[PDB]
């Protein structure tokens, strides 16, 4: 229950999503699900500097997601 309530009150916030491969994605959390699949709008991608800036929604696999965090 603590995670499902977390899920509800991070919709619309800016977040950092880090994958298992160590890639970091930053942007506005458009959606998430119970399996930790993510869509983010305005997503930057980091590893060794700036690697991608994204102009539409990006969808991320929950099986490959290591963490999701609010950005402040």
């Amino acid at each position: 229950q603590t995670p499902s309530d977390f899920l509800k009150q991070i919709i619309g916030r800016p977040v950092v999503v880090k994958l298992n491969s160590g890639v970091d994605y930053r942007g506005v959390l458009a959606c998430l699900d119970g399996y930790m699949n993510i869509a983010l709008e305005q997503t930057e991608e980091y590893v060794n500097g700036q690697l991608k800036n994204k102009y539409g929604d990006a969808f991320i696999r929950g099986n490959n997601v290591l963490y999701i965090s609010t950005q402040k």
Partner: protein, 85 residues
């Protein structure tokens, strides 16, 4: 609650950009996918990115090759991310 899968099925019939494991990307028209992120893409272009290193200086030169195909099934375990081009 639109799930990420519900919002990615809004991009059906459209051209998408898929970044895959092994320094590879695909661009193609999204005909189908499931919850595992298995995907059927039509009119696709695969790009394979590799690092060539100068033997003497250790300086890296980025090189690429490309493959194109009419219709292609992609296993979902190779997919890292989906976006548009």
């Amino acid at each position: 609650v639109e799930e990420p899968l519900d919002l990615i099925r809004l991009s059906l019939d459209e051209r998408i950009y898929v970044k895959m494991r092994n320094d590879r990307e695909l661009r193609g028209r999204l005909h189908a996918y499931d919850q595992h992120l298995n995907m059927i893409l039509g009119d696709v272009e695969e790009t394979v990115t590799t690092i060539e290193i100068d033997e003497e200086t250790y300086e890296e030169i980025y090189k690429s090759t490309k493959r194109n195909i009419p219709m292609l099934f992609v296993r979902g375990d190779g997919v890292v991310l989906v976006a548009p081009p």
